Write an enzyme that holds these catalytic residues in place. Structure first.
Site, PDB file in Angstrom:
ATOM      1  N   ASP A 102       4.476  14.197  -3.832  1.00 23.10           N
ATOM      2  CA  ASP A 102       3.606  13.611  -2.783  1.00 23.10           C
ATOM      3  C   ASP A 102       2.917  12.387  -3.379  1.00 23.10           C
ATOM      4  OD1 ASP A 102       1.807  12.873  -0.799  1.00 23.10           O
ATOM      5  OD2 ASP A 102       0.983  14.904  -0.503  1.00 23.10           O
TER       6      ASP A 102
ATOM      7  N   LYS B 155     -12.604  11.982   1.319  1.00 25.96           N
ATOM      8  CA  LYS B 155     -11.846  13.172   0.856  1.00 25.96           C
ATOM      9  C   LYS B 155     -12.030  13.396  -0.652  1.00 25.96           C
ATOM     10  CE  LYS B 155      -7.287  15.294   1.290  1.00 25.96           C
ATOM     11  NZ  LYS B 155      -5.963  15.191   1.934  1.00 25.96           N
TER      12      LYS B 155
ATOM     13  N   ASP C  94      -2.920  16.240   9.533  1.00 27.13           N
ATOM     14  CA  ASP C  94      -2.966  15.757   8.129  1.00 27.13           C
ATOM     15  C   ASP C  94      -4.219  14.882   7.993  1.00 27.13           C
ATOM     16  OD1 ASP C  94      -2.725  14.608   5.619  1.00 27.13           O
ATOM     17  OD2 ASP C  94      -0.823  13.522   6.089  1.00 27.13           O
TER      18      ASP C  94
ATOM     19  N   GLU D  90      -1.218  21.162   1.855  1.00 23.42           N
ATOM     20  CA  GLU D  90      -0.366  19.986   2.144  1.00 23.42           C
ATOM     21  C   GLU D  90       1.075  20.245   1.728  1.00 23.42           C
ATOM     22  OE1 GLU D  90      -2.619  16.711   0.574  1.00 23.42           O
ATOM     23  OE2 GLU D  90      -4.186  17.048   2.131  1.00 23.42           O
TER      24      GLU D  90
HETATM   25  N1  LIG Z   1       7.968   1.838   3.568  1.00 24.10           N
HETATM   26  C1  LIG Z   1       7.015   1.977   2.651  1.00 24.10           C
HETATM   27  N2  LIG Z   1       7.234   1.497   1.404  1.00 24.10           N
HETATM   28  C2  LIG Z   1       6.258   1.622   0.493  1.00 24.10           C
HETATM   29  N3  LIG Z   1       5.049   2.165   0.621  1.00 24.10           N
HETATM   30  C3  LIG Z   1       4.858   2.627   1.868  1.00 24.10           C
HETATM   31  C4  LIG Z   1       5.766   2.572   2.912  1.00 24.10           C
HETATM   32  N4  LIG Z   1       5.222   3.139   4.055  1.00 24.10           N
HETATM   33  C5  LIG Z   1       4.019   3.513   3.692  1.00 24.10           C
HETATM   34  N5  LIG Z   1       3.741   3.248   2.374  1.00 24.10           N
HETATM   35  C6  LIG Z   1       2.483   3.484   1.671  1.00 24.10           C
HETATM   36  O1  LIG Z   1       2.084   4.826   1.796  1.00 24.10           O
HETATM   37  C7  LIG Z   1       0.664   4.901   1.505  1.00 24.10           C
HETATM   38  C8  LIG Z   1       0.006   5.855   2.470  1.00 24.10           C
HETATM   39  O2  LIG Z   1       0.441   7.206   2.173  1.00 24.10           O
HETATM   40  P1  LIG Z   1       0.470   8.336   3.320  1.00 24.10           P
HETATM   41  O3  LIG Z   1       1.387   9.426   2.889  1.00 24.10           O
HETATM   42  O4  LIG Z   1       0.691   7.693   4.651  1.00 24.10           O
HETATM   43  O5  LIG Z   1      -1.010   8.981   3.371  1.00 24.10           O
HETATM   44  P2  LIG Z   1      -2.163   9.283   2.260  1.00 24.10           P
HETATM   45  O6  LIG Z   1      -2.489   7.993   1.553  1.00 24.10           O
HETATM   46  O7  LIG Z   1      -3.265   9.783   3.189  1.00 24.10           O
HETATM   47  O8  LIG Z   1      -1.626  10.334   1.334  1.00 24.10           O
HETATM   48  C9  LIG Z   1       0.159   3.446   1.536  1.00 24.10           C
HETATM   49  O9  LIG Z   1      -0.024   2.956   0.214  1.00 24.10           O
HETATM   50  C10 LIG Z   1       1.304   2.708   2.242  1.00 24.10           C
HETATM   51  O10 LIG Z   1       1.369   1.329   1.938  1.00 24.10           O
HETATM   52  K   LIG Z   2      -1.595  11.267   4.780  1.00 25.75           K
END
Ligand SMILES: Nc1ncnc2c1ncn2[C@@H]1O[C@H](COP(=O)(O)OP(=O)(O)O)[C@@H](O)[C@H]1O
Ligand SMILES: [K+]
Ligand SMILES: Nc1ncnc2c1ncn2[C@@H]1O[C@H](COP(=O)(O)OP(=O)(O)O)[C@@H](O)[C@H]1O
Ligand SMILES: [K+]
Lengths: 521, 521
Positions: free
Chosen positions: B197, B69, B7, B174
């Protein structure tokens, strides 16, 4: 119904039938065992087929049709067709890329016939010949074709039969039919068969192999414009010249006269295969003038010797195309009326260093004969299977007797379900116990057979060895389950084992290996 | 070798591997199962990737690179690029119509990096994470991209992997990867999958169909500038204002301080997905002054409720773009860390009238998980085919027994060449002849099967019906030629037929029709 065999020939057709254990070659309503492959449309609109079409004296040869077999299943632009139409006296025309035969059917009314429609008329005549003899309708036929015929030519021949009202069950090769007529399919080993087929219009040489029931046409050659009619034409040129010299009368350009002489020449030629002189006489041949000459064999041979010698080159070519030596030829089959010519028989015998050809079937009937044999086999397709499947024991079942001996209770190939018993006794005085070991297999000693199970019979009363009578019974039930009982007939003491398929079943591979030792003892 | 699934995320990247029957999501050298998509160039000329780049406190945010990205595979004049460069704190410049990221790599030395060169550095970090876990070189990867990515964007992502030393075997979508992680490809029927997502930077809603192995992305929507970082920013504005009110200290325009708070805010946010209060404490936060506040879930929700509610409109739009009703959605897949927020889960469940989403895979690992599953399937491309082709009989071969019954000798799918025999007998006392009719086909009565040939066995000695034992053998030789023998085992009297392919061969169309009746008896 009854299936006929038809030789649909370039110049002559022949029909046979396998009836009451024999091939009969059927004579037409003129009494002839062969029929000209000829159709004629008269000015009055009558249609002639066979002898009547060929023997019809006319000043117009353009509405008499023959040699349809040269055109059948071919395209207009086939170089064979473009060559052939040059010498054919009737009109051949192209329609949608195929050759059609154009005739006046009556009073200047033009019709175009497909070659297979002309051949359908010849096959109708052969069907009727067979129907007159059998006194019943003929619905089915085996029809022969040259080995070199392609799928289009085979299908157009089938279509000719369909139009004539025949179910053409099989198209088979002319040389193969001749081989079948001589019984050469019913022999062991790989044999090489040279078929030498000199007919009225064409010469065909075929190298066939017969190997364990399979026929292969290995190579073919010959000459599509070399036959008995070319020999007739040499005799014709000679007698036309001789008549002109002796009378000043030139019979050329008078078709009626040419036909009368050609017919007498053909009869004289046939006579010269049996004798060395023949009289050609025609009362009032040309304007009250009779014709009277004799032809010697020597002169007939002299007029044709180059043509006779030319038949050896195609034989040479099929031998090299099949990669065989003269000595590799196991069988020479002479086919076609022209093979009755002694000089032709001599040239073939000499080429093959004195080897004798097959003899006994008329060479102009042999292809029809073979077709009739094949027809006979295929008439059996409406028979009923009068066999009953037997359910049988695949392997001998028995017990171990003293010395590790296999003693059979149920021989291999016993019909099941079954019950078989034998009487056994003790090997020692006052023996108290039997051990019954149940074996499957064909070997005389149980060490080499498959053990199915064991049980004991206890409490055998005292007696000298061989005195007690223990009956061992093997029973196979309708479910193929084997039960073995041992009973002391003295007391009624008995024991039993039920033998299951589970985990001690032999594989069909193992069974086949054991069956190899069947029928040794 | 072993293929990894990556990913490559806008804000976080994740690497998994299918190993020993299970997907493992691999922790980096910091112990984190996700890695910031971040690169930083320090003034001393050191390069930081992942947690070290993001967590690096600096008064200069201009040489820390993220959101590559947003730029990858795009042209400078793409309106998406012109919008994005406005808020990005690092320099983006045009070179030959493409956007480049401009940084000081050390001592005022400027370099321009392609977006795919920045992503190559992130993929190098993910490769190394996987290599540390596996203790072997990683050469091959499946890499995910947004469903809306065009060919240029997919190729630039491939190029990032190539630069990082990866053979990118497949680029997959994705939402499809998330569906694959949840096993939704391995189900029967046409299912409609809504993928929701909500990541750190962007919101993507996808309507996928799964039908008989085929995935289709039917519609996509979302918001390219709505993610967890926007929720963090609302909490940030609030606590910056509160700190200013309580101390007079304004932490804005001091980047070091902003970074420390943002990091604590992000941890507190995550805690509020599990509990309803969280302490934010930073010892000596700003000039010896500590920071000490608590954040309630209610306040976190209040600060972000308009942003949370805005996620429903894109869901509405993909439903109308796919022409589906809420009730037509068979599967809801939550992807992205931000879907752990209870208010987000509640809003999605309510929108879909209480329907439960898929559960069991961490939403921030699900895309990597699916990539790893797909990687697992493609690692099988170096396996060897351990199958042997069997040559088998295409149709059951047998004979007609009394009543026009098809009695099989060679069952369909018997390995050839072969030899099979059965024992037959007479239907009548002293029956003198058998007619053996050889049939091909699966039907129980020979009237419905294909006749291959007939022959007779004559001279059966007198016996009661069922007593004579005639062995019928079917033999298929290495040339696929069928020979049938009938032998009277009593006498050795026998006859044989050789069956040829010629003119009585069924067409593959006819065979297929007959095979339809296989496995009925
Ligand atoms: N338990 C949680 N509660 C709220 N937000 C969360 C939690 N865990 C992760 N996040 C949030 O998820 C986001 C990251 O998204 P992620 O799916 O890991 O990848 P991407 O940003 O690359 O799509 C960040 O804003 C992070 O703070
Ligand atoms: K991600
Ligand atoms: N005894 C014979 N001597 C010489 N030629 C003969 C004899 N009998 C028949 N022929 C010739 O055989 C030719 C016909 O050949 P045949 O095998 O009957 O059929 P096809 O011409 O259809 O192949 C004619 O030229 C005929 O004159
Ligand atoms: K003939």
């Amino acid at each position: 119904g009854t299936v006929v065999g038809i030789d649909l020939g370039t110049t002559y057709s022949c029909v046979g039938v396998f009836k009451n254990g024999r091939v009969e070659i059927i004579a037409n309503d003129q009494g002839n065992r062969i029929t000209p492959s000829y159709v004629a449309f008269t000015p009055e609109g009558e249609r002639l087929i066979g002898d009547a079409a060929k023997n019809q004296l006319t000043s117009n040869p353009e509405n008499t049709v023959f040699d349809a077999k040269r055109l059948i299943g071919r395209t207009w632009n086939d170089p064979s067709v473009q060559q052939d139409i040059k010498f054919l006296p009737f009109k051949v025309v192209e329609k949608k890329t195929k050759p059609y035969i154009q005739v006046d059917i009556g009073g200047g009314q033009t019709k175009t016939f497909a070659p297979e429609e002309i051949s359908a008329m010849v096959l109708t005549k052969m069907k009727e010949t067979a129907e007159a003899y059998l006194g019943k309708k003929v619905t089915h036929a085996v029809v022969t074709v040259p080995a070199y015929f392609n799928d289009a030519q085979r299908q157009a021949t089938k279509d000719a039969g369909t139009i004539a009202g025949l179910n053409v069950m099989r198209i088979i090769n002319e040389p193969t039919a001749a081989a079948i007529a001589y019984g050469l399919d019913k022999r062991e080993g790989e044999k090489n068969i040279l078929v030498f087929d000199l007919g009225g219009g064409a010469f065909d040489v075929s190298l066939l192999t017969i190997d364990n029931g399979v026929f292969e046409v290995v190579a073919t050659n010959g000459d599509t414009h070399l036959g008995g009619e070319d020999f007739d034409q040499r005799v014709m040129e000679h007698f036309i010249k001789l008549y002109k010299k002796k009378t000043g009368k030139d019979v050329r350009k008078d078709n009626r006269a040419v036909q009368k002489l050609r017919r007498e020449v053909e009869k004289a030629k046939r006579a010269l295969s049996s004798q060395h002189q023949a009289r050609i006489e025609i009362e009032s041949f040309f304007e009250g003038e009779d014709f009277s000459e004799t032809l010697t064999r020597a002169k007939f041979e002299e007029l044709n010797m180059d043509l006779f010698r030319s038949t050896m080159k195609p034989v040479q070519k099929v031998l090299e195309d099949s990669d065989l030596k003269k000595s590799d030829i196991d069988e020479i089959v002479l086919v076609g009326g022209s093979t009755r010519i002694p000089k032709i028989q001599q040239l073939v015998k000499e080429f093959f260093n004195g080897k004798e050809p097959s003899r006994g079937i008329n060479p102009d009937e042999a292809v029809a004969y073979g077709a009739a044999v094949q027809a006979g086999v295929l008439s059996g397709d409406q028979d009923t299977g009068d066999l009953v499947l037997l359910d049988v024991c695949p392997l001998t079942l028995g017990i171990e007797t003293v010395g590790g001996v296999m003693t059979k209770l149920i021989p291999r190939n016993t019909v099941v379900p079954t019950k078989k018993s034998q009487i056994f006794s003790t090997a020692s005085d006052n023996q108290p116990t039997f051990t019954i070991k149940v074996y499957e297999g064909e070997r005389p000693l149980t060490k080499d057979n498959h053990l199915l199970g064991t049980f004991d019979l206890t409490g055998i009363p005292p007696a000298p060895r061989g005195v007690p009578q223990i009956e061992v019974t093997f029973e196979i039930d309708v479910n193929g389950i084997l039960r073995v009982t041992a009973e002391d007939k003295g007391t009624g003491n008995k024991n039993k084992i039920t033998i299951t398929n589970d985990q001690n079943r032999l594989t069909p591979e193992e069974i086949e290996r054991m069956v190899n030792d069947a029928e040794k003892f």
